[PDB]
Structure 1
Amino acid sequence: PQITLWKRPLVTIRIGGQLKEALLDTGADDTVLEEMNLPGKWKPKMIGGIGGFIKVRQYDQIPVEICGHKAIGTVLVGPTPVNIIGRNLLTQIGCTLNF
């Protein structure tokens, strides 16, 4: 799709079998989801945002379907204010910015 920006670019995703809403976030290097259970191994990591640093759980090589487009990559889980889809997955689905 082409998505304009007069509203937040919120989309439905599928992950670990479940639906969620998430924000397409070109200013995020990484995909960060609010607290949820995912299968498999994870590693403790830290990541910084505008307000400082948080602890997250890093899950690798995770399948995520975004507006019907498939990705498989790293998902961080922790106290983000909103689920965000970062560039690690936006690149997989072929996103670009256009003006």
Structure 2
Amino acid sequence: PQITLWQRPFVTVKIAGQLMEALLDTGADDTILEEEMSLPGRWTPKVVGGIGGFMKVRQYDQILVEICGHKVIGTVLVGPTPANIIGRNLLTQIGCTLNF
């Protein structure tokens, strides 16, 4: 699809059998999911800095993400973010471009 930006660019994603909406975010290097997201297995501590300051997150490697049905695999961060965010690490795998 081609998506205009008059509204926030949310899409439905399925991760580890769970459904959620996440923002397609060209300003994000990394993908981050909300605190209540349950991913199994080991993780590594990471800190993410946005506008406002920094927050501690859990880094999960090799997570399968189904983004508008497209299947991709990458690193997913989990922490106390206000919204689920799909960052460039996954946007590149769905062939996402900015056009104008």
- TM range, normalised to the smaller chain? over 0.9
SS at match of 2:54: strand
- Superposed CA offset, 1:57-91 (max 9, x none): 00001000111111100000001110000000000
Q: Is residue 2:88 matched to residue 1:87?
A: yes
Moved segments of 4+, more than 4 Å: none
SS at match of 1:64: strand
Normalized against structure 1, the TM-score is what? 0.97
- Identity rate of aligned residues, in percent? 84
What is the RMSD computed on CA atoms of the aligned residues? 0.6
Ranges in structure 1 where 5+ consecutive residues have no aligned partner: none
Between the two proteins, the alignment pairs up a number of residues equal to 99
Normalized against structure 2, the TM-score is what? 0.97
Ranges in structure 2 where 5+ consecutive residues have no aligned partner: none
* TM-fit CA distance, 1:51: 0.9
Paired position in structure 2 for 1:61: 62
